[PDB]
PDB file of all heavy atoms in Angstrom:
ATOM      1  N   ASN V   1      -1.895 -17.662   9.951  1.00 38.35           N
ATOM      2  CA  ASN V   1      -1.338 -16.572   9.090  1.00 38.35           C
ATOM      3  C   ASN V   1      -1.764 -16.735   7.678  1.00 38.35           C
ATOM      4  O   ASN V   1      -1.855 -15.703   6.895  1.00 38.35           O
ATOM      5  CB  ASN V   1       0.206 -16.772   9.143  1.00 38.35           C
ATOM      6  CG  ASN V   1       0.914 -16.130  10.228  1.00 38.35           C
ATOM      7  OD1 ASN V   1       1.403 -14.877  10.117  1.00 38.35           O
ATOM      8  ND2 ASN V   1       0.938 -16.792  11.350  1.00 38.35           N
ATOM      9  N   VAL V   2      -2.185 -18.000   7.226  1.00 36.20           N
ATOM     10  CA  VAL V   2      -2.594 -18.360   5.890  1.00 36.20           C
ATOM     11  C   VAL V   2      -3.768 -17.397   5.474  1.00 36.20           C
ATOM     12  O   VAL V   2      -3.655 -16.843   4.344  1.00 36.20           O
ATOM     13  CB  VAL V   2      -2.869 -19.821   5.727  1.00 36.20           C
ATOM     14  CG1 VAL V   2      -3.375 -20.119   4.349  1.00 36.20           C
ATOM     15  CG2 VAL V   2      -1.604 -20.576   5.911  1.00 36.20           C
ATOM     16  N   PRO V   3      -4.848 -17.054   6.197  1.00 33.96           N
ATOM     17  CA  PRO V   3      -5.932 -16.124   5.654  1.00 33.96           C
ATOM     18  C   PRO V   3      -5.325 -14.750   5.329  1.00 33.96           C
ATOM     19  O   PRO V   3      -5.841 -14.175   4.404  1.00 33.96           O
ATOM     20  CB  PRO V   3      -6.938 -16.163   6.775  1.00 33.96           C
ATOM     21  CG  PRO V   3      -6.814 -17.466   7.417  1.00 33.96           C
ATOM     22  CD  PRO V   3      -5.270 -17.622   7.485  1.00 33.96           C
ATOM     23  N   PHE V   4      -4.309 -14.236   6.109  1.00 32.00           N
ATOM     24  CA  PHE V   4      -3.759 -12.942   5.888  1.00 32.00           C
ATOM     25  C   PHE V   4      -2.898 -12.928   4.571  1.00 32.00           C
ATOM     26  O   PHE V   4      -2.975 -11.950   3.784  1.00 32.00           O
ATOM     27  CB  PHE V   4      -2.888 -12.487   7.103  1.00 32.00           C
ATOM     28  CG  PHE V   4      -3.734 -12.348   8.272  1.00 32.00           C
ATOM     29  CD1 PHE V   4      -3.805 -13.306   9.254  1.00 32.00           C
ATOM     30  CD2 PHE V   4      -4.436 -11.147   8.515  1.00 32.00           C
ATOM     31  CE1 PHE V   4      -4.630 -13.160  10.354  1.00 32.00           C
ATOM     32  CE2 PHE V   4      -5.304 -10.964   9.664  1.00 32.00           C
ATOM     33  CZ  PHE V   4      -5.275 -12.003  10.572  1.00 32.00           C
ATOM     34  N   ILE V   5      -2.081 -13.901   4.308  1.00 31.62           N
ATOM     35  CA  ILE V   5      -1.351 -14.093   3.089  1.00 31.62           C
ATOM     36  C   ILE V   5      -2.282 -14.000   1.882  1.00 31.62           C
ATOM     37  O   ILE V   5      -1.994 -13.345   0.947  1.00 31.62           O
ATOM     38  CB  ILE V   5      -0.433 -15.344   3.102  1.00 31.62           C
ATOM     39  CG1 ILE V   5       0.655 -15.305   4.223  1.00 31.62           C
ATOM     40  CG2 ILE V   5       0.250 -15.543   1.654  1.00 31.62           C
ATOM     41  CD1 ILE V   5       1.127 -16.711   4.667  1.00 31.62           C
ATOM     42  N   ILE V   6      -3.414 -14.754   1.952  1.00 30.75           N
ATOM     43  CA  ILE V   6      -4.342 -14.736   0.751  1.00 30.75           C
ATOM     44  C   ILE V   6      -5.014 -13.395   0.670  1.00 30.75           C
ATOM     45  O   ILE V   6      -5.055 -12.773  -0.451  1.00 30.75           O
ATOM     46  CB  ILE V   6      -5.359 -15.924   0.820  1.00 30.75           C
ATOM     47  CG1 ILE V   6      -4.662 -17.249   0.880  1.00 30.75           C
ATOM     48  CG2 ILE V   6      -6.416 -15.877  -0.303  1.00 30.75           C
ATOM     49  CD1 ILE V   6      -3.565 -17.609  -0.306  1.00 30.75           C
ATOM     50  N   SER V   7      -5.558 -12.837   1.790  1.00 33.51           N
ATOM     51  CA  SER V   7      -6.262 -11.607   1.768  1.00 33.51           C
ATOM     52  C   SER V   7      -5.364 -10.396   1.329  1.00 33.51           C
ATOM     53  O   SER V   7      -5.791  -9.600   0.508  1.00 33.51           O
ATOM     54  CB  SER V   7      -6.873 -11.321   3.183  1.00 33.51           C
ATOM     55  OG  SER V   7      -7.620 -10.038   3.157  1.00 33.51           O
ATOM     56  N   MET V   8      -4.312 -10.155   2.027  1.00 36.69           N
ATOM     57  CA  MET V   8      -3.353  -9.039   1.689  1.00 36.69           C
ATOM     58  C   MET V   8      -2.501  -9.191   0.357  1.00 36.69           C
ATOM     59  O   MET V   8      -2.011  -8.314  -0.246  1.00 36.69           O
ATOM     60  CB  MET V   8      -2.386  -8.850   2.844  1.00 36.69           C
ATOM     61  CG  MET V   8      -3.053  -8.680   4.196  1.00 36.69           C
ATOM     62  SD  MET V   8      -1.828  -8.662   5.579  1.00 36.69           S
ATOM     63  CE  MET V   8      -0.767  -7.321   5.100  1.00 36.69           C
ATOM     64  N   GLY V   9      -2.263 -10.556   0.018  1.00 33.70           N
ATOM     65  CA  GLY V   9      -1.337 -10.806  -1.011  1.00 33.70           C
ATOM     66  C   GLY V   9      -0.042 -11.158  -0.305  1.00 33.70           C
ATOM     67  O   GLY V   9       0.281 -10.535   0.728  1.00 33.70           O
ATOM     68  N   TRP V  10       0.905 -11.881  -0.960  1.00 33.76           N
ATOM     69  CA  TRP V  10       2.132 -12.254  -0.386  1.00 33.76           C
ATOM     70  C   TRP V  10       3.098 -11.129  -0.158  1.00 33.76           C
ATOM     71  O   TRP V  10       3.804 -11.039   0.853  1.00 33.76           O
ATOM     72  CB  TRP V  10       2.824 -13.463  -1.119  1.00 33.76           C
ATOM     73  CG  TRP V  10       3.286 -13.004  -2.544  1.00 33.76           C
ATOM     74  CD1 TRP V  10       2.530 -13.146  -3.669  1.00 33.76           C
ATOM     75  CD2 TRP V  10       4.472 -12.402  -2.966  1.00 33.76           C
ATOM     76  NE1 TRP V  10       3.223 -12.685  -4.750  1.00 33.76           N
ATOM     77  CE2 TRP V  10       4.395 -12.191  -4.359  1.00 33.76           C
ATOM     78  CE3 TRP V  10       5.625 -11.917  -2.305  1.00 33.76           C
ATOM     79  CZ2 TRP V  10       5.411 -11.646  -5.087  1.00 33.76           C
ATOM     80  CZ3 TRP V  10       6.622 -11.321  -2.988  1.00 33.76           C
ATOM     81  CH2 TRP V  10       6.534 -11.256  -4.368  1.00 33.76           C
ATOM     82  N   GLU V  11       3.062 -10.152  -1.057  1.00 32.09           N
ATOM     83  CA  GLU V  11       3.950  -8.906  -1.079  1.00 32.09           C
ATOM     84  C   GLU V  11       3.670  -7.983   0.200  1.00 32.09           C
ATOM     85  O   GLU V  11       4.508  -7.600   0.886  1.00 32.09           O
ATOM     86  CB  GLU V  11       3.849  -8.118  -2.418  1.00 32.09           C
ATOM     87  CG  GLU V  11       5.128  -7.789  -3.056  1.00 32.09           C
ATOM     88  CD  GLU V  11       5.038  -6.908  -4.307  1.00 32.09           C
ATOM     89  OE1 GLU V  11       4.955  -5.633  -4.145  1.00 32.09           O
ATOM     90  OE2 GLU V  11       4.909  -7.441  -5.403  1.00 32.09           O
ATOM     91  N   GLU V  12       2.339  -7.677   0.345  1.00 31.79           N
ATOM     92  CA  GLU V  12       1.935  -6.799   1.476  1.00 31.79           C
ATOM     93  C   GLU V  12       2.201  -7.524   2.793  1.00 31.79           C
ATOM     94  O   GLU V  12       2.459  -6.873   3.736  1.00 31.79           O
ATOM     95  CB  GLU V  12       0.392  -6.465   1.334  1.00 31.79           C
ATOM     96  CG  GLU V  12       0.193  -5.260   0.443  1.00 31.79           C
ATOM     97  CD  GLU V  12       0.600  -3.828   0.960  1.00 31.79           C
ATOM     98  OE1 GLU V  12       0.911  -3.743   2.054  1.00 31.79           O
ATOM     99  OE2 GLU V  12       0.461  -2.912  -0.010  1.00 31.79           O
ATOM    100  N   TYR V  13       2.032  -8.833   2.920  1.00 28.27           N
ATOM    101  CA  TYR V  13       2.324  -9.647   4.104  1.00 28.27           C
ATOM    102  C   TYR V  13       3.765  -9.531   4.391  1.00 28.27           C
ATOM    103  O   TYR V  13       4.131  -9.314   5.575  1.00 28.27           O
ATOM    104  CB  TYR V  13       1.893 -11.098   3.846  1.00 28.27           C
ATOM    105  CG  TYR V  13       2.190 -11.960   5.128  1.00 28.27           C
ATOM    106  CD1 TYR V  13       1.180 -12.192   6.054  1.00 28.27           C
ATOM    107  CD2 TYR V  13       3.447 -12.649   5.101  1.00 28.27           C
ATOM    108  CE1 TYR V  13       1.484 -13.107   7.083  1.00 28.27           C
ATOM    109  CE2 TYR V  13       3.704 -13.558   6.243  1.00 28.27           C
ATOM    110  CZ  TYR V  13       2.750 -13.687   7.223  1.00 28.27           C
ATOM    111  OH  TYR V  13       3.061 -14.411   8.356  1.00 28.27           O
ATOM    112  N   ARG V  14       4.628  -9.707   3.407  1.00 30.31           N
ATOM    113  CA  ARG V  14       6.142  -9.613   3.504  1.00 30.31           C
ATOM    114  C   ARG V  14       6.573  -8.199   4.099  1.00 30.31           C
ATOM    115  O   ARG V  14       7.679  -8.155   4.623  1.00 30.31           O
ATOM    116  CB  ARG V  14       6.717  -9.844   2.201  1.00 30.31           C
ATOM    117  CG  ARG V  14       7.341 -11.205   2.049  1.00 30.31           C
ATOM    118  CD  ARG V  14       8.360 -11.152   0.844  1.00 30.31           C
ATOM    119  NE  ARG V  14       9.699 -11.332   1.267  1.00 30.31           N
ATOM    120  CZ  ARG V  14      10.687 -11.846   0.511  1.00 30.31           C
ATOM    121  NH1 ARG V  14      10.338 -12.469  -0.668  1.00 30.31           N
ATOM    122  NH2 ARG V  14      11.874 -11.952   1.049  1.00 30.31           N
ATOM    123  N   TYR V  15       5.724  -7.185   3.912  1.00 30.39           N
ATOM    124  CA  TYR V  15       6.120  -5.750   4.469  1.00 30.39           C
ATOM    125  C   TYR V  15       5.974  -5.831   5.898  1.00 30.39           C
ATOM    126  O   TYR V  15       6.620  -4.813   6.557  1.00 30.39           O
ATOM    127  CB  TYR V  15       5.119  -4.681   3.798  1.00 30.39           C
ATOM    128  CG  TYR V  15       5.373  -4.199   2.458  1.00 30.39           C
ATOM    129  CD1 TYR V  15       4.397  -3.670   1.767  1.00 30.39           C
ATOM    130  CD2 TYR V  15       6.759  -4.256   1.978  1.00 30.39           C
ATOM    131  CE1 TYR V  15       4.659  -3.075   0.359  1.00 30.39           C
ATOM    132  CE2 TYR V  15       6.922  -3.589   0.695  1.00 30.39           C
ATOM    133  CZ  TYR V  15       5.945  -3.150  -0.141  1.00 30.39           C
ATOM    134  OH  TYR V  15       6.219  -2.601  -1.274  1.00 30.39           O
ATOM    135  N   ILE V  16       5.258  -6.616   6.618  1.00 30.95           N
ATOM    136  CA  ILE V  16       5.210  -6.659   8.129  1.00 30.95           C
ATOM    137  C   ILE V  16       6.447  -7.222   8.675  1.00 30.95           C
ATOM    138  O   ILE V  16       6.864  -8.263   8.575  1.00 30.95           O
ATOM    139  CB  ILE V  16       3.938  -7.537   8.579  1.00 30.95           C
ATOM    140  CG1 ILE V  16       2.624  -7.157   7.892  1.00 30.95           C
ATOM    141  CG2 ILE V  16       3.794  -7.587  10.082  1.00 30.95           C
ATOM    142  CD1 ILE V  16       1.790  -8.348   7.518  1.00 30.95           C
ATOM    143  N   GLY V  17       7.068  -6.250   9.537  1.00 26.88           N
ATOM    144  CA  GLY V  17       8.225  -6.546  10.274  1.00 26.88           C
ATOM    145  C   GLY V  17       9.482  -6.570   9.435  1.00 26.88           C
ATOM    146  O   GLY V  17       9.512  -6.038   8.225  1.00 26.88           O
ATOM    147  N   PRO V  18      10.584  -7.248   9.892  1.00 25.91           N
ATOM    148  CA  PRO V  18      11.824  -7.276   9.106  1.00 25.91           C
ATOM    149  C   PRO V  18      11.682  -8.153   7.871  1.00 25.91           C
ATOM    150  O   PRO V  18      10.939  -9.166   8.063  1.00 25.91           O
ATOM    151  CB  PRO V  18      12.883  -7.824  10.163  1.00 25.91           C
ATOM    152  CG  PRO V  18      12.182  -8.627  11.085  1.00 25.91           C
ATOM    153  CD  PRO V  18      10.783  -7.912  11.200  1.00 25.91           C
ATOM    154  N   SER V  19      12.221  -7.774   6.763  1.00 26.00           N
ATOM    155  CA  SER V  19      12.017  -8.482   5.547  1.00 26.00           C
ATOM    156  C   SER V  19      12.521  -9.940   5.545  1.00 26.00           C
ATOM    157  O   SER V  19      12.138 -10.771   4.749  1.00 26.00           O
ATOM    158  CB  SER V  19      12.555  -7.770   4.271  1.00 26.00           C
ATOM    159  OG  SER V  19      13.953  -7.538   4.421  1.00 26.00           O
ATOM    160  N   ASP V  20      13.555 -10.232   6.483  1.00 30.46           N
ATOM    161  CA  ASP V  20      14.066 -11.590   6.578  1.00 30.46           C
ATOM    162  C   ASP V  20      13.336 -12.472   7.497  1.00 30.46           C
ATOM    163  O   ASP V  20      13.422 -13.727   7.532  1.00 30.46           O
ATOM    164  CB  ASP V  20      15.545 -11.558   6.981  1.00 30.46           C
ATOM    165  CG  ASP V  20      16.027 -10.844   8.214  1.00 30.46           C
ATOM    166  OD1 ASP V  20      15.276 -10.121   8.765  1.00 30.46           O
ATOM    167  OD2 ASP V  20      17.256 -10.975   8.515  1.00 30.46           O
ATOM    168  N   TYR V  21      12.476 -11.920   8.418  1.00 31.29           N
ATOM    169  CA  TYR V  21      11.632 -12.689   9.269  1.00 31.29           C
ATOM    170  C   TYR V  21      10.228 -11.897   9.450  1.00 31.29           C
ATOM    171  O   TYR V  21       9.983 -11.319  10.319  1.00 31.29           O
ATOM    172  CB  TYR V  21      12.274 -12.821  10.720  1.00 31.29           C
ATOM    173  CG  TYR V  21      13.681 -13.504  10.601  1.00 31.29           C
ATOM    174  CD1 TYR V  21      14.802 -12.809  10.588  1.00 31.29           C
ATOM    175  CD2 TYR V  21      13.717 -14.863  10.541  1.00 31.29           C
ATOM    176  CE1 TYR V  21      16.036 -13.468  10.547  1.00 31.29           C
ATOM    177  CE2 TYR V  21      14.854 -15.585  10.488  1.00 31.29           C
ATOM    178  CZ  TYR V  21      16.013 -14.812  10.443  1.00 31.29           C
ATOM    179  OH  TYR V  21      17.325 -15.479  10.327  1.00 31.29           O
ATOM    180  N   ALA V  22       9.564 -11.984   8.320  1.00 32.82           N
ATOM    181  CA  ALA V  22       8.337 -11.172   8.163  1.00 32.82           C
ATOM    182  C   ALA V  22       7.037 -11.828   8.693  1.00 32.82           C
ATOM    183  O   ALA V  22       7.033 -13.135   8.902  1.00 32.82           O
ATOM    184  CB  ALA V  22       8.000 -10.914   6.623  1.00 32.82           C
ATOM    185  N   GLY V  23       6.066 -10.960   9.006  1.00 33.30           N
ATOM    186  CA  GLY V  23       4.765 -11.436   9.550  1.00 33.30           C
ATOM    187  C   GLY V  23       4.493 -11.329  10.920  1.00 33.30           C
ATOM    188  O   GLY V  23       5.568 -10.952  11.738  1.00 33.30           O
ATOM    189  N   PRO V  24       3.298 -11.373  11.438  1.00 36.49           N
ATOM    190  CA  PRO V  24       3.082 -11.230  12.866  1.00 36.49           C
ATOM    191  C   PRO V  24       3.630 -12.471  13.675  1.00 36.49           C
ATOM    192  O   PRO V  24       3.686 -13.501  13.006  1.00 36.49           O
ATOM    193  CB  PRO V  24       1.588 -11.157  12.982  1.00 36.49           C
ATOM    194  CG  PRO V  24       1.119 -11.902  11.735  1.00 36.49           C
ATOM    195  CD  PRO V  24       2.065 -11.572  10.714  1.00 36.49           C
ATOM    196  N   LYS V  25       3.952 -12.258  14.906  1.00 38.08           N
ATOM    197  CA  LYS V  25       4.389 -13.432  15.845  1.00 38.08           C
ATOM    198  C   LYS V  25       3.757 -13.260  17.165  1.00 38.08           C
ATOM    199  O   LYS V  25       3.686 -12.165  17.646  1.00 38.08           O
ATOM    200  CB  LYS V  25       5.883 -13.518  15.894  1.00 38.08           C
ATOM    201  CG  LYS V  25       6.518 -14.646  16.791  1.00 38.08           C
ATOM    202  CD  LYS V  25       6.304 -16.103  16.147  1.00 38.08           C
ATOM    203  CE  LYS V  25       6.709 -17.088  17.115  1.00 38.08           C
ATOM    204  NZ  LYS V  25       5.583 -17.523  18.096  1.00 38.08           N
ATOM    205  N   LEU V  26       3.313 -14.349  17.667  1.00 36.49           N
ATOM    206  CA  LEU V  26       2.666 -14.340  18.984  1.00 36.49           C
ATOM    207  C   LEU V  26       3.727 -14.644  20.051  1.00 36.49           C
ATOM    208  O   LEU V  26       4.527 -15.677  19.867  1.00 36.49           O
ATOM    209  CB  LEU V  26       1.492 -15.404  19.167  1.00 36.49           C
ATOM    210  CG  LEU V  26       0.328 -15.191  18.176  1.00 36.49           C
ATOM    211  CD1 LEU V  26      -0.725 -16.078  18.580  1.00 36.49           C
ATOM    212  CD2 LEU V  26      -0.153 -13.688  18.234  1.00 36.49           C
ATOM    213  N   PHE V  27       3.826 -13.949  21.077  1.00 35.74           N
ATOM    214  CA  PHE V  27       4.816 -14.002  22.164  1.00 35.74           C
ATOM    215  C   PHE V  27       4.081 -14.309  23.538  1.00 35.74           C
ATOM    216  O   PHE V  27       3.587 -13.370  24.122  1.00 35.74           O
ATOM    217  CB  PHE V  27       5.786 -12.875  22.311  1.00 35.74           C
ATOM    218  CG  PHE V  27       6.643 -12.741  21.060  1.00 35.74           C
ATOM    219  CD1 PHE V  27       6.274 -11.813  20.066  1.00 35.74           C
ATOM    220  CD2 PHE V  27       7.777 -13.546  20.842  1.00 35.74           C
ATOM    221  CE1 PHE V  27       7.064 -11.639  18.832  1.00 35.74           C
ATOM    222  CE2 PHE V  27       8.491 -13.431  19.621  1.00 35.74           C
ATOM    223  CZ  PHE V  27       8.110 -12.516  18.638  1.00 35.74           C
TER     224      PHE V  27
END
């Protein structure tokens, strides 16, 4: 996830999914 936070910025990354459990997740 770390390359995405740097590339997009923390705010844009936080927009992915619910704001309380943000970001992509592998299932």
Side-chain angles (χ1 to χ4, degrees):
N1 279 263
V2 176
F4 298 97
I5 297 156
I6 303 307
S7 182
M8 306 172 58
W10 64 268
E11 230 187 84
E12 278 285 354
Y13 177 91
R14 256 198 112 150
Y15 279 156
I16 306 142
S19 62
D20 57 346
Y21 301 97
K25 180 69 185 85
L26 301 187
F27 296 99

